[PDB]
Design a protein around this ligand. Structure first.
Ligand SMILES: Nc1ncnc2c1ncn2[C@@H]1O[C@H](CSCC[C@H](N)C(=O)O)[C@@H](O)[C@H]1O
Ligand SMILES: Nc1ncnc2c1ncn2[C@@H]1O[C@H](CSCC[C@H](N)C(=O)O)[C@@H](O)[C@H]1O
Lengths: 340, 340
């Protein structure tokens, strides 16, 4: 009901703290595939039996564990995803989004709404990507966090978009190559390029080699404000434009239009907000993502009209917006050069 | 699904921050019964139009508002409950549970689980009730917060428990008298007493007079560690025992047994945890309540077996546990003196 929903929302931060503790204490990996005794687990994470038992009971109450017998715990499917070693692990995603770096800025949300610029810079002393360039461990966590988030998109995009017409695809800000890898796996003849910062490009190059795609997927580093590597039939930009304000987005789309030339297409893979806000079944709430982009980066999520206008300016026109399965929350916006 | 549920939980703290902003900026009261333009609302709370629009869109995405047309907002039933002036308002509940006093202790959850004692004392310099005795404004907020929480119980208890056999009912730690008022309203011949701290007793006395129950509801102040006023047929103790550790609970139940004498009954109105933890449909998660009691007070929620043992010790026996409608989350534990 109306009261239950409100009460749920209000206790959200306490629920997050319970999940944060599970992740920080690596309890998912400690439990693993079996039934674990709380007394055995207590001598793994430096908590006493009583304290750990109360935390595990909360995690069972939140659908992350099962208490088969008093003091005996197994993971649910949800709990399994917080294992470091799970094939679709969101452990790094969980650690990143519960780290002081991503949560402290939210304590100052009203200031971000008042100033219209991020509170991250005030707390940590530089813009997020400048900061991560100086903190390799956070940069590594971020790369693995974005891999975890992008799995839902990577596992669905090729069944919702026809990649067969293209010889070459370049992923602009393509992270560790999670998205392009998934596309290349389904198209053996297709050639890929990941365009990233020098720091993340190191991660992508290792991922491409480890995945055995080095023969037909290359990695190139630079600044998408400077240029996007030319020559490709298709360009992807996923979860990238929402990191930047309108003028910075135009500059990225400007670099993209130069690379598109005559027979180049751009696929913007991002939240497409409705003109009228309403509840959304996406695994991550798109309006919470919007405010995340504000406090961390001074970015935002955008409507089709808002993006259509930013395209228009870049000498680009939104051709067509294609949906993904509703749990994903992202859409595929096809962008081509404007008649002019 | 399993991934969607986990993603939901992880973004809980950001959802809480969105609701906290709505409450702090009094946006619910600003919107009220009508459709409000974001530009008009912007000149009420010292946020610019763009910033406020993004917050309201998030609140619409979380089911608190409706965006009927771009920039035009009305409350949902859920949003209406954050109005100060709503007859079943949880505004004070929302402000209390998003205040630094109740949230900062959660940043140190692991320490509370390790030490087994509250982190509130470390942050704010004294036990919670000692602190609130020195902070009248927080004490007032707390009284109104507990009223908001107790509405679900107050509105159902008399239809799930027969109060007709009793001439007199005493509410031990009865807050502002929300629970006893609801019971007395349905039993015109019934006489009530609220037993509270001197500070909260002032609130209860005013509430009883305002409600026109002064003729058959009295307020008496003291310390339930010292005694509980005698002479009553029935004693209630709601959301009180969970505030205290096992030995402090025994001392409260000891005071209760003295007051019960020969023909006295005790009704413990509290979460009754299952032996095996599992998901719960209650408006407030009982395991999150358990950890709230730890970090704030060094208290806990308890199973029937755990309470049965604390009763046994107090010279009391749990007679019978009666359920409330599932959204409430509390049960009615009938406690009588032990044969001995
Ligand atoms: N100036 C710049 N030039 C190129 N890449 C940049 C950049 N500033 C940020 N980036 C990259 O932009 C990415 C945005 S995060 C999205 C990563 C990936 N597309 C995914 O969806 O999982 C980061 O990996 C970051 O390294
Ligand atoms: N030593 C003490 N003696 C009496 N009351 C006390 C006390 N310590 C705390 N309390 C009271 O115990 C109450 C617990 S909160 C629960 C209030 C009410 N029964 C409800 O459910 O809404 C507070 O109102 C607080 O003032």
């Amino acid at each position: 009901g109306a009261r239950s929903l409100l009460m749920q929302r209000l206790f959200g931060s306490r629920v997050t703290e319970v999940l944060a503790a599970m992740a920080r204490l690596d309890l998912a990996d400690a439990i693993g595939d079996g039934i674990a005794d709380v007394h055995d687990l207590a001598r793994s994470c430096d908590l006493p039996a009583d304290g750990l038992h109360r935390l595990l009971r909360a995690l069972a109450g939140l659908g992350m564990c099962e208490e088969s017998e008093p003091g005996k715990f197994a993971l649910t499917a949800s709990g399994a995803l917080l294992r470091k070693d799970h094939p679709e692990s969101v452990y790094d995603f969980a650690r990143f989004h519960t780290a002081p770096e991503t949560t402290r800025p939210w304590t100052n949300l009203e200031q971000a709404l008042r100033t219209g610029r991020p509170t991250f810079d005030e707390h940590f002393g530089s813009p997020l990507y400048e900061y991560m360039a100086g903190h390799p461990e956070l940069s590594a966590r971020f790369a693995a966090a974005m891999r975890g988030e992008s799995l839902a998109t990577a596992d669905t995009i090729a069944e919702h978009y026809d990649f067969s017409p293209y010889r070459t695809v370049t992923d602009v800000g393509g992270g560790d190559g999670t998205l392009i890898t998934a596309i290349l796996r389904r198209h053996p003849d297709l050639r890929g390029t990941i365009f990233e910062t020098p720091e993340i490009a190191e991660r992508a190059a290792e991922r491409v080699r480890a995945a055995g795609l080095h023969d037909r997927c290359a990695v190139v580093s630079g600044d998408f404000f400077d240029l996007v590597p030319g020559g490709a039939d298709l360009y992807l930009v996923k979860s990238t434009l929402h990191n930047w304000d309108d003028e910075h987005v135009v500059r990225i789309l400007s670099s993209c239009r130069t690379a598109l030339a005559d027979r180049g297409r751009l696929l913007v893979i991002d939240v497409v907000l409705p003109d009228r806000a309403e509840p959304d079944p996406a695994e991550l709430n798109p309006y919470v993502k919007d405010l995340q982009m504000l406090v961390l980066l001074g970015g935002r999520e955008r409507t089709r009209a808002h993006l259509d206008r930013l395209c228009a300016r870049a000498g680009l026109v939104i051709d067509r917006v294609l949906p993904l399965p509703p749990h994903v929350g992202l859409s595929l916006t096809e962008v081509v050069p404007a008649p002019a």
